[PDB]
Amino acid sequence: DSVDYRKKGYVTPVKNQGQCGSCWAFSSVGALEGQLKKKTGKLLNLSPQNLVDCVSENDGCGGGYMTNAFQYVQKNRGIDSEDAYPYVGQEESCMYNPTGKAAKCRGYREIPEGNEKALKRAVARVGPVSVAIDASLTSFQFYSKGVYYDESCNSDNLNHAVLAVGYGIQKGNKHWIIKNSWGENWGNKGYILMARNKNNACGIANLASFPKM
Numbered sequence: 001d002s003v004d005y006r007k008k009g010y011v012t013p014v015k016n017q018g019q020c021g022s023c024w025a026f027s028s029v030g031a032l033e034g035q036l037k038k039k040t041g042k043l044l045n046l047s048p049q050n051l052v053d054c055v056s057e058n059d060g061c062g063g064g065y066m067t068n069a070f071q072y073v074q075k076n077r078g079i080d081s082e083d084a085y086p087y088v089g090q091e092e093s094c095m096y097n098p099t100g101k102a103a104k105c106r107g108y109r110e111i112p113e114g115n116e117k118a119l120k121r122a123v124a125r126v127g128p129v130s131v132a133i134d135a136s137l138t139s140f141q142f143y144s145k146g147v148y149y150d151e152s153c154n155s156d157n158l159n160h161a162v163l164a165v166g167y168g169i170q171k172g173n174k175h176w177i178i179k180n181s182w183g184e185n186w187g188n189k190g191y192i193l194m195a196r197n198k199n200n201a202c203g204i205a206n207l208a209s210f211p212k213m
């Protein structure tokens with residue numbers, strides 16, 4: 001009962017959003033990229049700047065929703081690749097070019113709020129899913145190994161978007177395999193295993209969605 005899309009070729013390298021609040025842009029590209037591998041047999045790095053700069057419904061470097069982002073790609077008839085529209089770290093004039101198009105999107109599906117069971121099915125039958133979490137605890141910052149669980153995690157204090165690229169079981173503790181966007185040094189090679197089926201810890205299942213490519 002398990003999957004790690006990292007061995008599946010469903011996930012690109014770990015990126016570093018730096019000092020821009022565009023975690024939501026990385027989250028969405030991950031999902032789009034997982035769905036690209038899924039459909040065509042290969043992937044590439046998609047463009048979060050394109051999202052930072054062009055998702056008007058989002059707040060650029062000041063936060064945003066991946067739902068808005070999936071919808072943008074669809075309405076926009078695509079999104080660029082990393083090469084065509086490169087991450088710069090700050091919000092700028094939308095510079096989208098149809099020549100860079102490297103993924104399409106034709107809608108999205110939100111997971112019923114808080115239903116971890118359903119998120120486990122979407123990860124299984126769909127792929128890497130976009131989720132959001134409380135990442136404000138210190139324990140999270142210094143996360144290194146093992147299965148992250150902290151009692152002060154507030155599922156009502158959502159403040160960071162990430163990516164669920166799998167789920168498994170370690171030494172008897174169930175887990176979500178989470179790709180973050182703080183660089184590959186952060187956590188464990190840029191990843192953190194976050195408790196699963198533990199009362200929706202950190203709100204892992206409160207804001208989960210995915211694109212329909």
Ligand SMILES: *C(#N)N([C])[N]C(=O)OC([C])([C])[C]
Pocket residue numbers: 020021022023024062063064065066132133158159160161
């Ligand atoms: C990232 N980085 N941003 C700032 N966080 C974020 O957008 O969190 C919500 C709004 C919950 C998606």
